Coordinates of C-alpha atoms in Angstrom, one line a residue:
Chain A
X1 CA 17.6 -3.0 -7.3
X2 CA 16.8 0.8 -6.4
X3 CA 13.9 1.1 -8.5
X4 CA 12.8 -2.3 -6.6
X5 CA 13.0 -0.1 -3.3
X6 CA 11.3 3.2 -5.2
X7 CA 8.0 1.0 -5.6
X8 CA 8.2 -0.9 -2.6
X9 CA 8.1 2.0 -0.7
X10 CA 5.0 3.9 -2.6
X11 CA 3.1 0.8 -1.7
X12 CA 4.4 1.5 1.8
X13 CA 2.9 4.8 2.1
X14 CA -0.5 3.7 0.8
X15 CA -0.5 1.2 3.8
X16 CA 0.3 3.7 6.1
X17 CA -2.3 6.3 4.7
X18 CA -5.0 3.1 5.3
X19 CA -3.7 2.4 9.0
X20 CA -3.8 6.1 10.1
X21 CA -7.4 6.2 8.6
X22 CA -8.3 3.3 10.2
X23 CA -7.4 4.8 13.3
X24 CA -9.7 7.7 12.8
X25 CA -7.1 10.0 12.1
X26 CA -9.7 11.6 9.9
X27 CA -11.6 13.1 12.6
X28 CA -8.4 15.4 13.1
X29 CA -8.7 17.7 9.6
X30 CA -5.6 19.2 10.1
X31 CA -3.5 16.6 10.8
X32 CA -5.3 14.1 8.0
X33 CA -4.6 17.0 5.5
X34 CA -1.0 16.7 6.6
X35 CA -0.9 12.9 6.2
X36 CA -2.6 12.8 2.6
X37 CA -0.2 15.6 1.5
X38 CA 3.1 13.8 2.8
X39 CA 1.3 10.3 0.8
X40 CA 1.0 12.4 -2.6
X41 CA 4.6 13.8 -1.8
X42 CA 5.8 10.2 -1.5
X43 CA 4.2 8.8 -4.3
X44 CA 5.6 11.8 -6.5
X45 CA 8.7 11.5 -5.1
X46 CA 11.9 11.4 -8.0
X47 CA 14.2 9.8 -5.8
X48 CA 14.3 6.8 -2.9
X49 CA 16.4 9.6 -0.8
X50 CA 13.4 12.1 -0.9
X51 CA 10.3 9.4 -0.6
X52 CA 12.4 8.0 2.7
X53 CA 12.7 11.0 4.1
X54 CA 9.2 12.0 3.6
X55 CA 8.5 8.3 4.9
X56 CA 10.3 9.3 7.9
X57 CA 7.2 12.5 9.0
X58 CA 4.5 10.2 7.6
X59 CA 5.5 7.4 9.9
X60 CA 6.0 9.6 12.8
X61 CA 2.5 10.4 12.8
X62 CA 1.6 6.7 13.7
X63 CA 4.1 6.4 16.3
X64 CA 3.0 9.4 18.1
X65 CA -0.1 7.5 18.5
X66 CA 0.9 5.6 21.7
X67 CA -1.9 2.5 22.9
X68 CA -3.2 2.9 19.4
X69 CA -0.3 0.2 18.2
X70 CA 0.9 -2.0 19.6
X71 CA 5.1 -2.3 20.8
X72 CA 4.8 -5.8 19.7
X73 CA 4.6 -4.7 16.1
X74 CA 7.4 -2.7 16.8
Chain B
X1 CA -14.5 -9.0 15.1
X2 CA -13.5 -9.5 11.2
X3 CA -12.4 -5.6 10.9
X4 CA -9.8 -6.1 14.1
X5 CA -8.4 -9.3 12.7
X6 CA -7.6 -7.1 9.2
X7 CA -6.5 -4.2 11.1
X8 CA -4.1 -6.3 13.0
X9 CA -3.0 -7.9 9.7
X10 CA -2.6 -4.9 7.9
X11 CA -0.6 -3.4 10.8
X12 CA 1.9 -6.5 11.0
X13 CA 2.5 -6.1 7.2
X14 CA 3.0 -2.4 7.5
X15 CA 5.6 -2.9 9.8
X16 CA 7.1 -5.8 7.9
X17 CA 7.6 -3.8 5.0
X18 CA 8.8 -0.9 6.8
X19 CA 11.9 -3.4 7.9
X20 CA 12.0 -4.8 4.3
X21 CA 12.9 -1.0 3.1
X22 CA 16.1 -1.2 5.7
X23 CA 16.0 2.3 5.7
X24 CA 18.8 3.8 9.1
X25 CA 16.2 6.8 9.4
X26 CA 13.1 4.3 9.4
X27 CA 14.7 1.6 11.4
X28 CA 16.0 4.1 14.1
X29 CA 12.5 5.7 14.6
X30 CA 10.6 2.3 14.8
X31 CA 13.5 0.9 17.5
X32 CA 13.4 3.9 19.2
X33 CA 9.4 3.6 19.6
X34 CA 9.8 0.2 20.3
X35 CA 11.4 1.6 23.5
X36 CA 8.8 4.3 24.0
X37 CA 10.9 7.3 22.8
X38 CA 8.3 8.4 20.5
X39 CA 7.8 11.9 18.9
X40 CA 5.0 14.3 19.8
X41 CA 4.9 16.4 16.5
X42 CA 6.0 15.1 13.1
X43 CA 9.7 14.5 12.7
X44 CA 10.5 17.5 10.4
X45 CA 13.5 17.5 7.5
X46 CA 14.3 21.4 7.3
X47 CA 17.6 22.6 9.2
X48 CA 16.8 24.5 12.8
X49 CA 12.8 22.6 12.3
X50 CA 11.6 22.3 16.1
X51 CA 11.1 18.2 17.4
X52 CA 9.8 17.5 20.4
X53 CA 10.2 13.7 22.0
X54 CA 8.8 11.8 24.7
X55 CA 11.8 10.4 26.8
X56 CA 10.2 7.6 29.1
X57 CA 13.4 6.7 31.3
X58 CA 17.0 7.3 31.9
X59 CA 18.3 4.2 30.0
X60 CA 17.0 5.7 26.9
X61 CA 18.0 9.2 27.7
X62 CA 21.6 7.9 27.9
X63 CA 20.7 6.2 24.7
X64 CA 19.6 9.0 22.6
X65 CA 21.3 12.2 24.2
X66 CA 24.8 13.0 24.8
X67 CA 25.9 16.6 25.8
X68 CA 23.5 18.6 24.3
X69 CA 23.1 16.7 21.3
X70 CA 20.1 14.4 20.5
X71 CA 20.6 11.5 17.8
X72 CA 17.1 10.7 16.0
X73 CA 15.9 9.7 12.5
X74 CA 19.6 9.5 11.2
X75 CA 20.0 13.5 12.4
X76 CA 21.3 15.7 15.2
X77 CA 19.4 17.8 17.2
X78 CA 20.5 20.3 19.4
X79 CA 18.8 20.5 22.6
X80 CA 16.7 23.2 23.7
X81 CA 14.5 22.6 26.7
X82 CA 13.9 19.7 29.0
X83 CA 10.6 19.2 30.9
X84 CA 9.2 16.7 33.0
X85 CA 5.5 14.9 33.3
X86 CA 4.5 18.2 35.1
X87 CA 6.1 20.7 32.5
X88 CA 8.7 22.0 35.3
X89 CA 11.6 22.8 33.6
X90 CA 14.7 20.4 34.0
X91 CA 18.3 21.3 33.6
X92 CA 20.8 18.4 31.9
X93 CA 22.7 18.5 34.7
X94 CA 19.9 16.7 36.9
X95 CA 19.5 13.6 34.8
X96 CA 22.2 11.3 36.3
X97 CA 22.1 7.8 37.2
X98 CA 21.8 8.8 40.6
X99 CA 19.4 11.6 40.4
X100 CA 17.0 10.3 37.9
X101 CA 14.4 8.4 40.2
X102 CA 13.9 12.3 41.9
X103 CA 12.5 13.1 38.2
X104 CA 9.0 12.8 37.3
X105 CA 9.5 10.5 34.4
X106 CA 8.6 10.5 31.3
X107 CA 10.5 13.7 30.1
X108 CA 9.8 15.8 26.7
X109 CA 13.0 16.8 24.8
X110 CA 12.6 20.2 22.4
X111 CA 14.9 20.1 19.7
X112 CA 16.2 21.5 16.8
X113 CA 17.8 19.7 13.8
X114 CA 21.5 20.4 13.3
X115 CA 23.5 22.1 10.4
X116 CA 26.6 21.6 9.7
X117 CA 27.1 23.8 6.8
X118 CA 28.7 27.8 7.0
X119 CA 27.1 28.0 10.7
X120 CA 27.9 31.8 10.9
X121 CA 26.7 33.0 7.5
Chain C
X1 CA 7.3 -16.7 0.6
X2 CA 7.2 -14.5 3.9
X3 CA 8.3 -11.8 1.9
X4 CA 6.3 -12.6 -1.4
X5 CA 3.4 -12.6 1.6
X6 CA 3.9 -8.7 2.4
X7 CA 4.5 -8.0 -1.1
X8 CA 1.0 -9.5 -2.3
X9 CA -0.8 -8.1 0.9
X10 CA 0.5 -4.3 0.2
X11 CA -0.6 -4.6 -3.2
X12 CA -4.2 -5.6 -2.3
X13 CA -4.4 -2.4 -0.6
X14 CA -3.3 -0.4 -3.1
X15 CA -6.0 -2.1 -5.4
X16 CA -8.6 -1.2 -3.2
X17 CA -7.2 2.4 -3.0
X18 CA -7.1 2.8 -7.2
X19 CA -11.0 1.3 -6.7
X20 CA -11.4 3.8 -4.2
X21 CA -10.2 6.6 -6.2
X22 CA -12.4 5.2 -9.0
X23 CA -15.6 5.7 -7.4
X24 CA -16.2 1.6 -6.7
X25 CA -17.5 2.9 -3.0
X26 CA -20.9 3.9 -5.0
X27 CA -21.8 0.6 -6.3
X28 CA -22.7 -0.9 -2.9
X29 CA -22.9 -4.2 -3.7
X30 CA -19.8 -4.3 -5.3
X31 CA -17.7 -2.3 -3.1
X32 CA -18.8 -4.6 0.1
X33 CA -17.0 -7.8 -2.4
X34 CA -14.3 -5.9 -3.6
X35 CA -13.5 -5.4 0.5
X36 CA -14.1 -9.0 1.1
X37 CA -11.6 -9.9 -1.2
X38 CA -9.3 -7.9 0.2
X39 CA -9.9 -8.9 3.7
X40 CA -9.6 -12.4 3.0
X41 CA -6.1 -11.6 1.2
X42 CA -5.0 -9.9 4.2
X43 CA -6.2 -12.7 6.3
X44 CA -4.4 -15.3 4.0
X45 CA -1.9 -17.7 5.4
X46 CA -0.4 -18.9 2.1
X47 CA 0.3 -17.6 -1.4
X48 CA -1.9 -20.1 -3.6
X49 CA -5.2 -18.7 -1.5
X50 CA -3.9 -14.9 -1.8
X51 CA -2.7 -15.1 -5.2
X52 CA -6.3 -16.6 -6.2
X53 CA -8.1 -13.8 -4.5
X54 CA -6.4 -11.0 -6.0
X55 CA -7.0 -12.4 -9.4
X56 CA -10.6 -12.1 -8.2
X57 CA -9.8 -8.7 -7.0
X58 CA -7.9 -7.6 -9.8
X59 CA -10.4 -8.2 -12.3
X60 CA -12.6 -5.7 -10.8
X61 CA -10.1 -3.3 -12.2
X62 CA -9.9 -5.1 -15.2
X63 CA -13.6 -4.8 -16.2
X64 CA -13.1 -0.9 -16.0
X65 CA -12.4 0.3 -19.5
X66 CA -11.2 3.6 -19.7
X67 CA -10.4 3.8 -15.9
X68 CA -6.8 2.4 -16.6
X69 CA -4.6 3.7 -19.7
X70 CA -3.1 0.7 -21.8
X71 CA 0.3 2.2 -20.8
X72 CA 0.4 0.9 -17.2
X73 CA -1.0 -2.3 -18.8
Chain D
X1 CA -2.4 17.8 -9.1
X2 CA -4.5 14.5 -8.3
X3 CA -4.4 13.2 -11.6
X4 CA -0.3 13.1 -11.2
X5 CA -0.7 11.1 -8.1
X6 CA -3.5 8.5 -9.2
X7 CA -1.4 8.0 -12.2
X8 CA 1.7 7.1 -10.0
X9 CA -0.6 4.9 -7.8
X10 CA -1.1 3.1 -11.0
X11 CA 1.7 3.2 -11.9
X12 CA 3.0 1.5 -8.9
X13 CA -0.2 -1.1 -8.7
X14 CA 1.0 -2.3 -11.9
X15 CA 5.0 -2.2 -11.0
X16 CA 4.1 -4.2 -7.8
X17 CA 1.8 -7.0 -9.9
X18 CA 4.7 -7.3 -12.0
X19 CA 6.7 -8.0 -9.1
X20 CA 4.8 -10.7 -8.0
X21 CA 5.5 -12.6 -11.0
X22 CA 2.3 -15.0 -10.5
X23 CA 1.4 -16.7 -14.2
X24 CA -2.5 -16.3 -13.4
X25 CA -2.6 -12.2 -12.5
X26 CA 0.2 -11.8 -15.5
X27 CA -1.7 -13.7 -18.1
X28 CA -5.2 -11.5 -17.0
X29 CA -2.9 -8.2 -17.0
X30 CA -1.5 -9.0 -20.7
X31 CA -4.9 -10.0 -22.2
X32 CA -6.1 -6.8 -20.6
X33 CA -3.5 -4.8 -22.6
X34 CA -4.6 -6.5 -25.7
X35 CA -8.5 -5.5 -25.1
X36 CA -9.6 -9.0 -23.5
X37 CA -11.4 -7.8 -20.3
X38 CA -14.0 -9.5 -17.8
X39 CA -17.4 -8.4 -17.3
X40 CA -17.8 -10.1 -14.0
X41 CA -15.6 -11.0 -11.0
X42 CA -13.4 -13.7 -12.1
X43 CA -14.6 -16.9 -10.2
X44 CA -12.6 -19.9 -8.7
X45 CA -15.0 -22.2 -7.8
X46 CA -15.5 -25.4 -10.4
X47 CA -17.7 -24.8 -13.0
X48 CA -18.9 -21.3 -12.1
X49 CA -19.6 -18.7 -14.7
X50 CA -17.2 -15.9 -16.7
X51 CA -17.9 -13.5 -19.1
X52 CA -15.0 -11.9 -21.2
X53 CA -14.9 -9.3 -24.0
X54 CA -13.3 -10.8 -26.9
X55 CA -12.3 -7.8 -29.3
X56 CA -10.7 -9.2 -32.5
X57 CA -10.0 -12.7 -33.9
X58 CA -6.1 -12.8 -33.1
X59 CA -7.2 -12.3 -29.8
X60 CA -9.9 -15.2 -30.1
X61 CA -7.5 -17.6 -31.7
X62 CA -4.8 -16.3 -29.2
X63 CA -7.0 -17.6 -26.3
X64 CA -9.4 -19.9 -27.8
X65 CA -9.2 -23.5 -28.9
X66 CA -12.3 -25.8 -30.0
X67 CA -14.9 -25.2 -27.3
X68 CA -12.1 -24.3 -24.6
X69 CA -10.8 -21.0 -23.0
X70 CA -7.4 -20.5 -21.5
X71 CA -7.6 -17.8 -18.9
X72 CA -6.3 -16.6 -15.7
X73 CA -4.1 -19.8 -15.6
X74 CA -7.3 -21.9 -16.1
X75 CA -9.5 -23.7 -18.6
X76 CA -12.8 -22.7 -19.3
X77 CA -15.7 -24.7 -21.2
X78 CA -17.2 -22.1 -23.9
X79 CA -21.2 -22.1 -23.3
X80 CA -22.2 -19.3 -25.7
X81 CA -20.8 -16.4 -27.9
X82 CA -22.7 -13.1 -28.7
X83 CA -21.5 -10.3 -31.2
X84 CA -22.2 -6.3 -30.5
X85 CA -25.9 -6.9 -31.3
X86 CA -26.2 -9.2 -28.8
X87 CA -26.9 -12.0 -31.5
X88 CA -25.4 -15.7 -30.8
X89 CA -22.7 -16.8 -32.6
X90 CA -21.3 -19.8 -33.4
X91 CA -18.3 -20.8 -33.7
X92 CA -17.8 -22.1 -36.9
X93 CA -18.3 -18.5 -37.8
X94 CA -15.2 -17.5 -36.0
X95 CA -12.5 -18.1 -38.8
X96 CA -9.9 -15.8 -40.1
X97 CA -11.9 -15.4 -43.6
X98 CA -15.5 -14.6 -42.1
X99 CA -14.6 -12.4 -38.6
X100 CA -14.7 -9.7 -40.9
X101 CA -17.9 -9.9 -41.2
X102 CA -18.8 -10.3 -37.9
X103 CA -19.7 -7.6 -34.8
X104 CA -16.8 -7.4 -32.6
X105 CA -16.4 -7.4 -30.0
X106 CA -17.1 -10.8 -29.2
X107 CA -18.9 -11.6 -25.8
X108 CA -17.8 -15.5 -24.2
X109 CA -19.6 -17.1 -21.7
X110 CA -17.7 -20.0 -20.2
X111 CA -17.5 -22.4 -16.9
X112 CA -14.7 -23.1 -15.4
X113 CA -13.0 -26.8 -15.4
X114 CA -11.7 -28.5 -12.7

C-alpha cells in the first residue's frame, strides 16, 4: 500500500524532471541544478512524507511557468 | 510535430500520476494553479522560509486568505507584504469586494511558513 | 486500465532515463530507436500496444550485461 | 552520490515493471535473472529474427523444446545455434550428458512464429 505509493511517487518525479527538461529549464543553470537535487532527494527518500514534501517543491517549479503548460491538464 | 504530441501525452500522464498519488499538499497546489494562484519561488519546507505567490482575483484571494494567514500546500503562512501588478504596497484593508475593481490585479503575496511550536523560544 | 495506462507510460520514461544514464545516447542509431519506442508507448491508446513496445525497449537494457545487477533482476 | 541515485532509479524501475504484472515483461526479466539475455531488440513481427544468449543447460531446457524457443510470451523457431568459439552446434549435441563438453554460453538465433 504505502510501498506502492513510494515507487509511484519516485516514478512521478522522473517524469516531472523530464517534463521540466523538455521545457528548456536546463538553460537556467541555477534553477536546473535545484530541480535535479530535488529529484535526487525524492529518489533517495526514506518515507512517503519526505518524498511528498520534496515533490511539492519540485512541482512548484513547473507550476510557476504559466503558459508553458495549460490549465486544461490542471 | 511528433515531439509536441509526445510532450502533450507526457504532461497529461504526469498530472494523471499526480492525482493518483492523492496527496493533500500536491492536490492543493495543483487546484490553486488551475485557478491562477501560482508560486513565484520554490515552495520551501523550513519554518519562517519565504514564499511568494500570485493571486489573480478577489475570489481566489478570499478562497486562500483570512486575516494575515495564507493557506497553501497543506501549510499556514504568515503574510508579510502584498503588492499589486505595478509593485505598489497594498494594505489588506483595501482588498474588499467593493474595492477590488480599483486594484491592479494580480496581487503578489509574500508570506512565511508558520510555526506552532514554542513561538517565544 | 486508465491507471494501468498511466503506470506503463510512467515506467517508459524511467526506462529511457536509466538508459540515458547508461550512455546509450553515444550510440546515435540505437538511441534513436529507443526514443521512437518510448514515443510510441507515450502515444499508445491501448495497453497491449504499450506493453509490446515496452518489451522491445526493455530488451535494450537487459542486453547490457554488467550494467544492472542481478539483485534488482 | 550519483551511484546511490542511479541504484535507486533502477530499483524503482524494476519495482514498477513488476507492478505492471505483464507476462511478457515478467518472462524476459526472469530469464535475464538467470542469464538468458537478448542480443538484439526483441522484434514484434511475424518471422522477425531474435538472438539470445543461453548460459547453461538448465536454462536451455527451461526455454527450448524440439526446435521451439519460448520467450517474451511468444514462440520462436530456432534457426541456428553457436557456441562461444562461434562454431555451429547441432541441437542433438545439447544433452544432459554431453553439455559439459560444449563451449557455453550458446547463442540461439530464432524467428518469431505467428
